[PDB]
Amino acid sequence: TCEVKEKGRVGTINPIFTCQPAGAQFVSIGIKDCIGIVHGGQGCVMFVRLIFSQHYKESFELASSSLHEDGAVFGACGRVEEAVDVLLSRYPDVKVVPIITTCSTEIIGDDVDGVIKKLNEGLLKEKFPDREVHLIAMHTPSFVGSMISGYDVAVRDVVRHFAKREAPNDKINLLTGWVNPGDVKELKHLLGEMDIEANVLFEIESFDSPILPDGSAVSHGNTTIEDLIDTGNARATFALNRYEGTKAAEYLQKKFEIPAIIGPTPIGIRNTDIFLQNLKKATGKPIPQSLAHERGVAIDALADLTHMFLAEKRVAIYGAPDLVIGLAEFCLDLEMKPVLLLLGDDNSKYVDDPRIKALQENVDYGMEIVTNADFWELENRIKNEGLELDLILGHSKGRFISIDYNIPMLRVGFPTYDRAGLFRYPTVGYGGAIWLAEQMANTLFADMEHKKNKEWVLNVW
Amino acid sequence: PHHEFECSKVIPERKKHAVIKGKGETLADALPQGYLNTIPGSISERGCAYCGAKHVIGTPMKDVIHISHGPVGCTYDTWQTKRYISDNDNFQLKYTYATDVKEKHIVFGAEKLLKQNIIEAFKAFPQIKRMTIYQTCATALIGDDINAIAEEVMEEMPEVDIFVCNSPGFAGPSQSGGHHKINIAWINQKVGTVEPEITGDHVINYVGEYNIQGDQEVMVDYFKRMGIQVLSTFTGNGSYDGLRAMHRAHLNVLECARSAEYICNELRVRYGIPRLDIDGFGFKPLADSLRKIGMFFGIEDRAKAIIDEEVARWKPELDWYKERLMGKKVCLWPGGSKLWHWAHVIEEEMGLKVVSVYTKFGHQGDMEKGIARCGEGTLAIDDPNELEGLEALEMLKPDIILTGKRPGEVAKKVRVPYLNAHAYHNGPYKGFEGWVRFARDIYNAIYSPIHQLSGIDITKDNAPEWGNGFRTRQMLSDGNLSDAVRNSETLRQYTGGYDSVSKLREREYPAFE
Amino acid sequence: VEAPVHPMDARIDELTDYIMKNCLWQFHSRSWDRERQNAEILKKTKELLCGEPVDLSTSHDRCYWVDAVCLADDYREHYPWINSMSKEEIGSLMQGLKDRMDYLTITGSLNEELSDKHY
Ligand code: CLF
Ligand SMILES: [Mg+2]
Ligand SMILES: [S]
């Protein structure tokens, strides 16, 4: 049966995620003309910019308040004030400036809402009166939740800041979740075929930036102030990822009565079907033949693989909880046996997830879902408790388990730095169902050749 | 004279932190400021004091549980971003630990949490009996006494030893404060606590080497061929108990002065051990370094032999690249020591023109070394920020920069190639072979046909034909070489394999008695 | 502090350049260390350049000596004019050098950290 249990150890060995501020920084890099300031020590931002570099091989703009010894003793609201001044004074185009707290500035208790109000009435009116500048508090203490909850918080804070319901319209708010450019592309394709306009939070396709002959391009997000304000006017909010867009979706529900459709994460055929059904329901638009065709093209790809190769494969999955769960679900439709799911933070709401209730009702073999997990929860099981696996699905930080215990691994989630180009491919939708199934197969195939495990069978499947 | 960036006029203090080496100017005439606080909002390249302590110096130790007392973030953000390898199966890259400080610890403290963590860690890794606890922002602020907890555990558990590093992010302007803190904490807590078996008449500490892509293994190979016992390395490929015996060295060979001069300075004071500064990079600096180390022990013959065979083996290949690299402009933009290790020898030996150097966290001593070795005209920058970096690229138009990963990707967008000065490309870059590897990577970056393609505007109505589906590096590089060069019988491209270090781990070293 | 002067400033321009471009022993961490280093190594360089014996009776001496030997040798090779100069002129050249080196690295130094009493 499928047993949900909390990690036993109190400590962390080999972490799956980083802290809430990293999630707020990720939200912020997805907004046009946005540069967050991370209020804390320099590493809290510089290390996170490296994370994003590791995934994308691009540099994104984020600043530090540069906390030092004095501010840690006496308070550091002045460090923020100077930061805002220095940032605005040197970056003329910036219009959005999140103020993102860290463990330090939360503990020492700096009044961020206070110092923002001061700058709005003060500095911004005096020195910068001709400029649009939105300062936004993001309270993201590192000693609760994770980058995942930080993301949820930040999306709420940006929508809370900007959303107004002046001119109701028929658009939806699509909160993609923390996904790849290839996911944004896929989701936009689905919306286009449904003929449904949306505010897409976030438009990060432009993270894949060119080298132009005139050296003029840069990676940036394209979610605009206008789009964020327009979130108040939508007829519904589709928050695909419950752990990354519940707060913003419910905020708009509670504040403007915009209905929130939370999940399921559209991973796999069946979950993509539910998305399209939910769009129809919300908007009244019919599901067109063209998507039934693309769906069937996807199913064809899956048919070639499922009972021949994927059936009964033993899978471990980790990463963002919505990804983990979505993948587990799709794997079961692919006849596979996900046997260990790691959910690598303290969220108390996993046990209440309907998708996890369904797994508990319906799974009929030995499965574990470990909450507050770390990578030692997987490695210890392999090394000392005889867990047998055919495949891992997760991000690159788990890689040494794959490498050193000879279990092949498909790179999914964030960050994926030990493979090239993965951000351009979908994991959601019908296109993503194709990509996941074919790449799991291709991963298994390479492994069968490595180990000489019936490698000769790959001829007339 | 001092230099002021257009981008930094609105922050006039920045003028004090950069100088162009003027005609006839000596070190007494101008020197950048250094080791001052950071300007908030500037998008400085700098990191935190926990970075300098834990991430740079502490973690290289290969037989140690590196546990960060704090929330998960600090630990995750320092994991799998470094290439300090080891001959203990890269234990220090594969396993990392955080205590996972939570809300309820903010009021009450997290000393119980810490101790439980320590026991869990030793239990999970029964082959590891050494630990270093690193303080972070959060645990500094809540005031846990890490030192007391570590002593409580060592009393309970005599088979283990625990080093304590109290260097949180905010403790200082940059990496630099953490270098100091861990240097001093190590010598205060740990040096003198172990008596080492000596296995030779010639004994060194190799100090300030972090073994990026095998640099330490390159150097220690030379030393083992000289019949020198390397008592310890601080800290690349280093053993915890090896470092506890640093007091017994006959000499401190110091490569990275920035990070490790502190501990050498105190070893001279406390135990009378002399300090010899060396260079790890380049044929001359390295030969001089090896000559001096051998001559100090009366075994200069052995060092001369090594120098002779290595230069013969590799100089024909270095010179291949030099000939194609002549006059190419380079910015030396690491964090610290590398900038001055490289500044002269790279001009002399690879033919590059150094047009700029920069230090993220360096002191005025590093700018001294930097400016001393650079040519007139060179822009030196202290605590550079992103806009200044970009303006320097526009102003100097370098052919390549040696810099960090993400700064490399900034340069990428404006058509300037990079090598990773920090983590290397096809490293390691120390040693004779390493210097050729280095030169080759520079060649391959500069003369990339993809780089040449990126400069072409395909929309341009004027653009000429191509009528050819490729252009090789050597097509783009060899067009204007002397017939003598181009047709040489000695000059050749790098002949070494992908991994230049694995062979050394097998190598056998004859005792000289 | 004023830059020192010397009859043989031309030739000290050359020898100073070399040390700035090649040597590290002149850039230790604190003024008192720099005084010691400048004095001890330029001492043994003169001694060696002047056929005079050198004292190798502590490990510190050997450490100064090794930098001294290399510096002497490069002077004889790369600056071979020095080789046709009497012990009188050489001792004069070395005193001029030490003074410039002490100026550039100690008394004229813009490195503010050289007086920190703590390492
Ligand atoms: S300056 Fe450096 S990296 Fe920053 S916190 Fe401080 S020691 Fe650490 Fe840590 S858990 Fe996350 S990443 Fe920060 S907000 Fe706190
Ligand atoms: Mg790219
Ligand atoms: S730094």
Q: Which one of B184, B344, B368 has the shortest CB-CB distance to C111?
A: B368
Mutate-to-test residue for ligand 1 from A52, A103, A105, A106, highest number of ligand atoms within 8 A of CB: A103
Q: Is residue C95 within 8 Å of residue C27, measured between CB atoms?
A: no
Long-range contacts, stretch C21-25, CB < 8 angstroms, 24+ apart? C21/B344, C21/B372, C21/B373, C22/B284, C22/B285, C22/B288, C22/B344, C22/C74, C23/C67, C23/C71, C24/B257, C24/B277, C24/B278, C24/B279, C24/B369, C25/B276, C25/B277, C25/C67
Count CB neighbours of B252 within 10 A: 26
Nearest-10 crossing angle of helices A43-56, A20-29:
60
Do residues A79 and A65 touch, judged by C-beta distance below 8 A?
yes
The continuous run of DSSP H or E covering A367 comes out as strand A367-371
Q: Give dist(CA B157, CA A382) in Å, integer.
A: 28
B281 Rama sector, left if φ>0, alpha if ψ -120 to 50, beta otherwise: beta
Q: How distant is the Cα of A67 from the closest Cα of chain B, in angstroms?
A: 6
Closest to B373 (Cβ–Cβ): which among C21, C65, C113? C21
Task: Report which bound ligand comes closest to the CA of A423.
Answer: 2
Q: Which residue in B6, B10, B77 has the most chain A C-beta atoms within 10 A of its own C-beta, making it the best mutation to test that interface? A: B77
Across the interface, whether the CB atoms of C67 and B276 are under 8 A apart is answered: yes
- Strand (E) or helix (H) holding B133: strand B130-135
Contact (CB, 8 A) for C108 and B28: yes
Instruction: Say if CB B417 and CB B411 are below 8 A apart.
Output: yes
C-alpha B193/C-alpha C26 separation (Å) is 33
One-letter amino acid at B381 equals I
Residue B120: its chain A contacts at CB < 8 A?
9-11, 13
Sequence-separated (6 or more) residues with CB below 8 Å from residue A416: A55, A395, A396, A422, A423
Q: Which residues are CB-neighbours of A158 under 8 A, at least 6 positions away?
A: A27, A31, A98, A136, A228, A248
Q: What distance in Å separates residue B72's CA from the closest CA in chain C?
A: 33
Chain A residues closer than 8 Å to B409 by CB: 53, 57-59
Instruction: Give the other-Cβ count within 10 Å of B72's Cβ.
Output: 28
Alpha helices in A77-196 (DSSP H): 77-90, 103-107, 112-121, 123-127, 147-162, 181-194
Which chain B residues are closer than 8 Å to C119 by Cβ? Answer: 184, 262, 265-266, 269
Cα A190 from Cα A188, distance rounded (Å): 5
Closest residue to C63, CB basis, from B35, B262, B296: B296
Interface-testing mutation among B201, B271, B296, with chain C (most C C-beta atoms within 10 A): B296
Contact B243/A at CB under 8 A: no
Which residues from chain B sit within 8 angstroms of residue C25, using beta carbons?
Answer: 276-277
Tell how far the Cα of B451 is from the centroid of ligand 2, in angstroms: 14
Specify the residue with its C-alpha closest to ligand 1, atom 10: B73
Distance CA B406, CA A59 (A): 5
Way the structure was solved = X-ray
Tell me, yes or no, whether chains C and A touch by having 3 or more C-beta pairs under 8 A.
Answer: no
Nearest chain C Cα distance for residue B177, angstroms: 12
What is d(CA C66, CA B292) in angstroms, rounded to the nearest whole number? 5
Interface B–C counts its CB contacts (< 8 A) at: 96
Distance CA B238, CA B63 (A): 8
Residues from chain A that touch B73, judged by Cβ atoms under 8 A, are 18-19, 21-22, 44, 103, 142
Residue B163 near residue B189 (C-beta atoms within 8 A): yes
Q: Whose CA is nearest to atom 4 of ligand 1?
A: A44
Distance from CA of A414 to the nearest CA of B (A): 13
Percentage helix, strand, coil for chain A under 3-state DSSP, each rounded to 5: 50, 15, 35
Residue A23: exposure state from Cβ atoms within 10 A (0-12, 13-18, ≥19): buried
β-pairing, B379-382 with B18-20? antiparallel
Say if residue A301 is exposed, middle or buried (CB neighbours under 10 Å; 0-12, 13-18, 19+): middle
Tokens, residue B474: 């050597």
Domain count, chain C: 1
Q: Degrees (nearest 5) of the Cα angle A43, A150, A252?
A: 145
Task: Quote the minimal CA–CA distance from A209 to chain B in Å.
Answer: 8
Maximum pairwise Cα distance, chain A: 75
- C-alpha to C-alpha distance for A365 and B285, rounded to whole angstroms: 65
Cα–Cα distance, A359 to A369 (Å, whole number): 10
Please answer whether residues A163 and A231 qualify as being in contact, where contact means their C-beta atoms are separated by less than 8 angstroms.
yes
Q: State the residue range of the domain holding C24.
A: 1-119
The two beta strands, A37-39 and A409-411, are unpaired
Handedness of CA C51, C52, C57, C61 (dihedral sign): negative
Torsion angle defined by CA atoms of residues B168, B171, B172 and B177, in that order, rounded to the nearest 10 degrees: -60
A40, B410: Cβ pair inside 8 Å? Answer: no
Instruction: Give the span between the Cα atoms of A322 and A333, in whole angstroms.
Output: 17
Residues framing ligand 3 (Cβ under 6 A): B 46-47, 174-175, 360-361
* Residues of chain B that touch chain C, judged by Cβ-Cβ distance less than 8 Å: 26-28, 30-31, 35, 184, 250-251, 257, 261-262, 265-266, 269, 272-279, 284-285, 288, 291-293, 295-296, 344, 363-365, 368-369, 372-373
Which of these, B2, B331, B336, lies nearest to B174 by C-alpha position?
B336
Index of the ligand 1 atom closest to the CA of residue A102: 14
> How many whole angstroms separate alpha carbon A260 and alpha carbon A253?
6
| Domain spans of chain A, in order of start | 18-163, 164-265, 266-312+429-461, 313-413
From the list B81, B397, B428, the residue with the least C-alpha distance to B419 is: B428
| Contact by Cβ (8 Å): B246, B194 | no
**Do B288 and C70 count as a contact with CB atoms less than 8 A apart?**
yes
Resolution (A): 1.5
CB-ligand 1 contact for A23 (6 Å cutoff): no
Q: What CATH number belongs to B49-190?
A: 3.40.50.1980
Are B265 and C119 an interchain contact pair (Cβ–Cβ within 8 Å)? yes
CA-nearest residue of chain B to A381? B124
Contact B369 C27 (CB under 8 A): yes
User: For residue C3, what is the nearest residue in chain B, using CA coordinates?
Assistant: B28
Question: In A217-320, which residue ranges form alpha helices assigned H by DSSP?
Answer: 225-230, 242-256, 268-283, 289-303
Our mutation pick for probing the ligand 1 site, out of A49, A79, A142, A346, counting the most ligand atoms within 8 A of Cβ, is A142
CA torsion, ordered C103, B381, A38, A200, to nearest 10 deg = -170
Q: Residue A388 belongs to what H/E stretch?
A: none
DSSP helix/strand/coil, A122: coil
- Partners of B278 on chain C (C-beta within 8 Å) are 24
Q: Cα(B357)–Cα(B336) distance, rounded to whole angstroms?
A: 10
Closest Cα of chain B to A64: distance in Å? Answer: 6
Cβ distance of C29 and B365 shorter than 8 Å: yes
